[PDB]
């Protein structure tokens, strides 16, 4: 009985906490969504109602988002520099090895979620998703759970799982979300982590369900898809470049920096204001399809009907409010053809999107990118339709094309072909399986050969302590050997040395693991000793050895001339905590994680 209970406990306990976390995440997503939604509705109502006078309308359009943005900023600013505007990259860094304790603290939670919510409410004017922040939150929760329960590896795994769950929840999409997270965040992942993530996602889905009460492709087609993917990749590279440079400029340019220092919220507010005017429906949004929710846009993009043909058949009417059945009517204009409108959107979102990303607040930057990709895809589809009105020898459905574009562009941006999978999941259909995937792959090829990932770019801009190789990031990763960053301080307990001396040493340092040396002159290692054990022995060094104190031999030895990178890799893979260094056999020093972290920091920031 007791034995059975014991057996049940560890594994079961592990499962249970994860499940709980998942549930919590689901709850957060539901509640957050609800909070967003009502606000959005209210805003819409206000827009409808305030009147026909222009100024008032403008104010309604412009003020509400601005205020929200400001609110988001303010909460972020008060706690710590690395709180707001950071999720995935930070997580990645953590996974790589270097720990930033500021990131996992729970005092930060309440201020960030609210900000995220505000951002969401602000919506399609500001044009930002929720992913990264959500992921961060999830990770934090996981960390908290771990702490409550209370090795490094296990903790890391837990964090990963949490992240996966977070990703799933935002997407409302279990199967692929976790995979995507794994692709983006980590490296040296295990299947069990993935499984855990999946489980969490499933739990979240279940929770959502529970809470529901409240509330045949041809051969040229493939070629076309590939072309689309390529185009996306091209575009994505450019986008990535822009992201890399704009952020740098912001960091750099002195006046801007000063302004930020004075008031980040002010900067954010200003940005919002700038966005808002451009958006404004009757002035310029009639061209940009402005008057639409975030999901609404996506829906419009991935619509089954082929727009150009429809337009040709009949001029669509501009309604008072956007039709729930016919979202795509927003994209049409008489003077500017649907194609033209799409082009405009592409031009303008790109211009704006980077700016939006820049502004300091809790916000996600995946969804917008996806939407952009979809738009591009749709344009291509439309073009194809125009070319071949009959179709290829079944007609060309541009929805599929749009979907492919969304999959592809995002993947290119993110260096992750899980994007395709995610897209498929969102669709609900696995009939577009190959071509889309191929397109995504193509995009990745063109993007990953030229540029770093969006996330990677962001990390570079930050100068966060992440060791691995990134494209377009000049740094001395191969040069720094162990000699430069190793700890020269050692506590050599040689056989030959007297007992009093040893005692004194013990009294002084009290290190976790003392090295055992052959003799004082040679300084050559013959294994290791633990401190507590030594103390015990003393209470009760050749003499000591004779008496019978256990010599745990050194399993693995680094040279001083070995590269930092290799060492780091070793540390990551074998799950080690410390490791001694030998030069011609001599105990020169002692590599821990701390030293490695320090080295990484140095590399990042001169």
């Amino acid at each position: 009985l007791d034995w059975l209970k014991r057996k049940l406990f560890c594994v079961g306990e592990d499962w249970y906490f994860l499940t709980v976390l998942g549930v919590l995440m689901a709850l957060i997503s539901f509640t957050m969504s609800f909070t967003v939604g009502r606000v959005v509705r209210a805003h819409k109502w206000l827009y409808r109602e305030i009147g026909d006078s222009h100024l008032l309308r403008y104010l309604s359009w412009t003020v509400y988002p601005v205020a929200l943005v400001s609110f988001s900023s303010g909460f972020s600013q008060s706690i710590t520099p690395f709180s707001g505007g950071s999720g995935i990259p930070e997580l990645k860094t953590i996974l790589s090895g270097v720990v930033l304790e500021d990131y996992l603290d729970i005092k930060n939670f309440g201020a960030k979620a609210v900000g995220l919510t505000c951002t969401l409410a602000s919506g399609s004017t500001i044009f930002l998703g929720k992913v990264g922040p959500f992921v961060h939150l999830s990770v934090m929760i996981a960390a908290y759970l771990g702490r409550v329960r209370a090795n490094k590896s296990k903790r890391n795994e837990m964090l990963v799982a949490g992240a996966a769950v977070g990703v799933a929840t935002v997407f409302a999409a279990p199967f692929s979300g976790v995979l995507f997270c794994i692709e983006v965040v980590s490296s040296h992942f295990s299947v069990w982590d993935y499984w855990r993530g999946f489980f969490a996602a499933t739990c979240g889905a279940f929770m959502f369900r529970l809470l529901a009460v409240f509330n045949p492709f041809d051969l040229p087609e493939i070629f076309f898809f590939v072309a689309l993917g390529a185009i996306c990749g091209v575009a994505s590279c450019a986008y990535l470049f822009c992201q890399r440079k704009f952020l740098g400029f912001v960091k750099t340019n002195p006046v801007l920096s000063k302004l930020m220092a004075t008031s980040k919220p002010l900067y954010s507010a200003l940005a919002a204001l700038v966005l808002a005017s451009v958006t404004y429906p009757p002035g310029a949004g009639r061209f940009m399809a402005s008057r639409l929710s975030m999901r609404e846009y996506l829906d419009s993009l991935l619509d089954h009907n082929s727009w150009a043909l429809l337009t040709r058949q009949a001029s669509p009417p501009w309604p008072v409010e956007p039709d729930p059945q016919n979202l795509w009517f927003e994209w049409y204009h008489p003077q500017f053809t649907i194609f033209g409108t799409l082009a405009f959107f592409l031009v303008m979102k790109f211009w704006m999107l980077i700016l939006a990303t820049t502004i300091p607040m809790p916000a996600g930057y995946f969804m917008p990118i996806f939407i952009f990709g979809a738009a591009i895809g749709r344009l291509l589809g439309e073009a194809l339709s125009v070319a071949f009105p009959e179709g290829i020898v079944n007609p060309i459905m541009p929805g599929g094309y749009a979907l492919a574009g969304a999959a592809a562009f995002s993947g290119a941006v993110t260096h992750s072909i899980s994007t395709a999978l995610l897209a498929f999941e969102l669709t609900g259909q696995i009939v577009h399986a190959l071509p889309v995937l191929m397109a995504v792959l193509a995009a990745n090829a063109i993007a990953q050969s030229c540029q770093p990932s969006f996330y990677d770019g962001t990390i570079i801009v930050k100068k966060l302590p992440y060791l691995p190789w990134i494209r377009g990031r000049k740094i001395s990763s191969h040069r720094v050997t162990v000699e430069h960053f190793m700890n020269r301080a050692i506590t050599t307990l040689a056989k030959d040395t007297p007992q009093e001396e040893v005692v004194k040493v013990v009294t002084s340092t009290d290190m976790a693991e003392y090295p055992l040396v052959a003799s004082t002159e040679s300084q050559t290692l013959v294994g290791t000793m633990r401190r507590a054990q030594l103390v015990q022995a003393l209470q009760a060094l050749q003499d000591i050895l004779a008496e019978g104190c256990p010599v745990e031999p050194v399993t693995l030895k680094l040279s001083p001339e070995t590269s930092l990178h290799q060492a780091h890799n070793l540390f990551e893979l074998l799950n080690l905590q410390s490791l001694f260094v030998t030069s011609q056999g001599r105990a020169v020093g002692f590599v821990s994680w701390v030293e490695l972290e320090k080295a990484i920091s140095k590399l990042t920031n001169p």
Partner: antibody, heavy 111, light 107 residues
Framework: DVQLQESGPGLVKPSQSLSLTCTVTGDSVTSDYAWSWIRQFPGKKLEWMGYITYSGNTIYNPSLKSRISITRDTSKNQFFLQLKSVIIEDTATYYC??????WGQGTSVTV | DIVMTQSPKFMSTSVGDRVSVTCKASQNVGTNVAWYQQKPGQSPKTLIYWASYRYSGVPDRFTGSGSGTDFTLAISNVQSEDLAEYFCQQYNSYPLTFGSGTKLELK
């Protein structure tokens, strides 16, 4: 106020190619619309013929690809059919239209 | 060709009553369906270009609805001037198809 007006011969001998001139007033042919042809039988059942784009690429009903041929003159703003291999079953009242929005008054073709 | 099967074929009502003509498509059309009125002799004038969007210069009593595979034209407060045939046309797919047509007499 876009207005379409058909014109052509009513009585026709079978196995002799017919042609109908549809003139436009109020709108240019070079605009991006579906300049389409439709016909209604004596039993009051509508059948879609086809249409030309702004550029000139013609699209037809799959059932009548062989016989139908539709053209335009951009100078006069008109539409010309060249319906060949005429049969007594083809006897109908024809209708030249701008997709779905505006329709012509139509002419009664007889074989 | 995607067939547009409609019903009921014949109708006979008084002045003031409601009439509802139903159209059904074999494949999914979306909302890309237009309604016509043809009085005997004249050309068929369009009423509702997209399901539930009336044309300019048409009375409000002609209320259309539906999406996907089924659609309805609803007419309330029928007058003596509405003795006519009513067709539904789809225009999602090529070729463009039509309904057979509903003749409407009055008492």
């Amino acid at each position: 106020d876009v207005q379409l007006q058909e014109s052509g011969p009513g009585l026709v001998k079978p196995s002799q190619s017919l042609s109908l001139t549809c003139t436009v007033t109020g709108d240019s042919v070079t605009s991006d619309y579906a300049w389409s042809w439709i016909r209604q039988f004596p039993g009051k059942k509508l059948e879609w013929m086809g249409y030309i784009t702004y550029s000139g690429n013609t699209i037809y009903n799959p059932s009548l690809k062989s016989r139908i041929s539709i053209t335009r003159d951009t100078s006069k703003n008109q539409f010309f059919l060249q319906l060949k291999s005429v049969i007594i079953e083809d006897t109908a009242t024809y209708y030249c239209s701008r997709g779905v929005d505006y329709w012509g008054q139509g002419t009664s073709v007889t074989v | 060709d995607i067939v547009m099967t409609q019903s009921p074929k014949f109708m006979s009502t008084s002045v003031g009553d409601r009439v509802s003509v139903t159209c059904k498509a074999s494949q999914n059309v979306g909302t890309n369906v237009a309604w016509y009125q043809q009085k005997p002799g004249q050309s068929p004038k369009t009423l509702i270009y997209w399901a539930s969007y009336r044309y300019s210069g048409v009375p409000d009593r002609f209320t259309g609805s539906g999406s996907g595979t089924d659609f309805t034209l609803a007419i309330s407060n029928v007058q003596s001037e509405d003795l006519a045939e009513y067709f539904c046309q789809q225009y999602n797919s090529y070729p463009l198809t039509f309904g057979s047509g509903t003749k409407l007499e009055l008492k």
